[PDB]
């Protein structure tokens, strides 16, 4: 049965707002390098064939009407960890980092950073909950259509490594 | 532009160590030993 | 500052003055406060102690900076006056075992 662990009722803490903004910046930056590699160029006018698009600008120059597409999934992710009761805290080193506080974007290669075994199990659980979220949405769409049962609607254990890889690396990068 | 005369008369040597991203620098020490 | 490694790999620079025995360290282009003074005729081995938190740990760079000689000249007598950095096959990484 596909269900997400419901987390709409709880609310976000104020301390995590800086982390949300910073991870939104990083996600936007990775988005930017992806389309710079693809050949997309910056420009106010938007054309698909010309690969011109106004949002390869710096995150501060980004308007608010576009910023929600990054903050939103982050908000539901952090709400998912809070719903399970995972106590999230901040070290004094993190507060020191906040004290420290044309456009060539550049991200952090997180692959070299490694998590512990407990954090790996944590990421596996949050990945299972993501696959349940996507499975519930896909099953609602699938009952709306009425046919063509999707092959990946099978349980997360039945899912293989490659199919689980994208969600697993999403959990990995957020924990990193 | 390095001064060639200084480079020839100097006895000062240098090596550098690059800690790759993802490796905690608090776990890394750099220097000389006997 | 922090985040000195994630954007670009952190770069410790070790400077040794064989004529005076003064040991100075520069990190990311700024000179660190820690310094050492050794006795004459001291033999100093470049050393890195690291606990692995990543598949790639560190790199031994054998370059040179402004007004400073590369390590190869001080190591090898034949290259004493050769400003081009070198890594001859004799130089290799050893570990405590």
Question: What does the alpha-carbon distance between residue C49 and residue C20 come to, in Å, rounded to a whole number?
Answer: 26
- The Cα C30–Cα C28 span in angstroms is 6
**DSSP structure class, residue C28:** T
- A111 and B22 within 8 Å at the Cβ level: the answer is yes
Helix H or strand E encompassing B16? strand B12-19
Q: Are C59 and B16 in contact (CB under 8 A)?
A: no
Instruction: Tell me the nearest-neighbour CA distance from C8 into chain A, angstroms.
Output: 8
DSSP C48: E
- Contact yes or no for A152/A131 (Cβ under 8 A): no
Please, what is the Cα angle at C73 between C70 and C74, to 5 degrees? 95
SS3 C15: strand
Q: Is A121 helix (H, G, I), strand (E, B) or coil?
A: helix
End-to-end Cα spacing for chain C = 35
Measured over the CA atoms of residue A20, residue A21, residue A26 and residue A31, the dihedral's sign is positive
Nearest to C71 by CA among C91, C95, C89, C57: C91
Residue found by looking up tokens 């301390």 in the block: A15
Chains in contact with B, counting 3 or more C-beta pairs less than 8 Å apart as contact: A, C
Q: CB B14 to CB C16 under 8 A? A: yes
Q: How far is Cα C79 from Cα C71, in angstroms, rounded to an integer?
A: 10
Calculate how close chain B gets to A109, using CA atoms only, in Å. 7
A113: which chain B residues are within 8 Å (Cβ-Cβ)?
22
Question: Closest to C11 (Cβ–Cβ): which among B10, B18, B34?
Answer: B18
DSSP structure class, residue A47: B
Neighbours of C87 (CB within 10 A): 14
What's the distance, CA A117 to chain centroid?
21
- Using CB atoms, which residue from A110, A112, A114 is nearest to B20? A112
Other C-beta atoms closer than 10 Å to the C-beta of C86 total 15
Contacts 24+ apart (CB under 8 A), A80-88: A80/A4, A80/A5, A80/A7, A80/A126, A80/A129, A81/A126, A82/A7, A82/A10, A82/A12, A83/A5, A83/A6, A83/A7, A83/A10, A84/A5, A84/A125, A86/A122, A88/A13, A88/A16
Tell me the Ramachandran region of residue C37: left when phi exceeds 0, alpha when psi lies from -120 to 50, beta otherwise.
Answer: beta
């Amino acid at each position: 049965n596909p269900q997400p662990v419901d987390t709409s009722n709880i609310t976000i803490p104020e301390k995590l707002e800086y982390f949300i903004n910073k991870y939104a910046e990083h996600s936007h930056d990775k988005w930017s390098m992806d389309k710079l590699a693809n050949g997309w160029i910056y420009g106010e006018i938007y054309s698909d064939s010309s690969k011109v698009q106004p949002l390869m600008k710096p995150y501060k120059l980004l308007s608010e009407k576009e910023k929600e597409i990054y903050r939103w999934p982050i908000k539901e992710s952090l709400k998912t960890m809070l719903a399970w009761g995972w106590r999230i805290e901040r070290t004094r080193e993190g507060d020191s980092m906040a004290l420290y506080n044309g456009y060539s974007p550049r991200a952090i290669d997180m692959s070299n950073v490694t998590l512990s075994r407990d954090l790996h199990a944590m990421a596996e659980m949050m990945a299972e909950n993501y696959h349940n979220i996507w499975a519930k949405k896909k099953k609602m769409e699938l009952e709306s259509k009425g046919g063509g049962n999707h092959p990946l609607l099978v349980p997360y254990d039945t899912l293989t490594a490659k199919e689980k890889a994208k969600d697993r690396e999403k959990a990995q990068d957020i924990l990193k | 532009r390095d001064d060639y005369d200084f480079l020839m008369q100097t006895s000062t040597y240098y090596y550098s160590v690059r800690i790759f991203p993802g490796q905690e620098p608090a776990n890394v020490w750099v220097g000389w030993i006997t | 500052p922090g985040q000195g490694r994630n954007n670009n790999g952190l770069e410790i620079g070790c400077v040794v003055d064989a004529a005076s025995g003064l040991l100075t360290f520069i990190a990311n282009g700024k000179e660190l406060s820690t310094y050492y003074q050794v006795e004459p005729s001291t033999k100093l081995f470049p050393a890195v102690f690291a606990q692995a938190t990543s598949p790639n740990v560190f790199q031994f760079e054998l370059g040179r900076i402004k007004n400073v000689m590369p390590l190869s000249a001080g190591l090898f007598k034949s290259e004493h006056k050769n400003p081009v950095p070198q890594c001859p096959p004799r130089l290799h990484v050893q570990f405590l075992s």
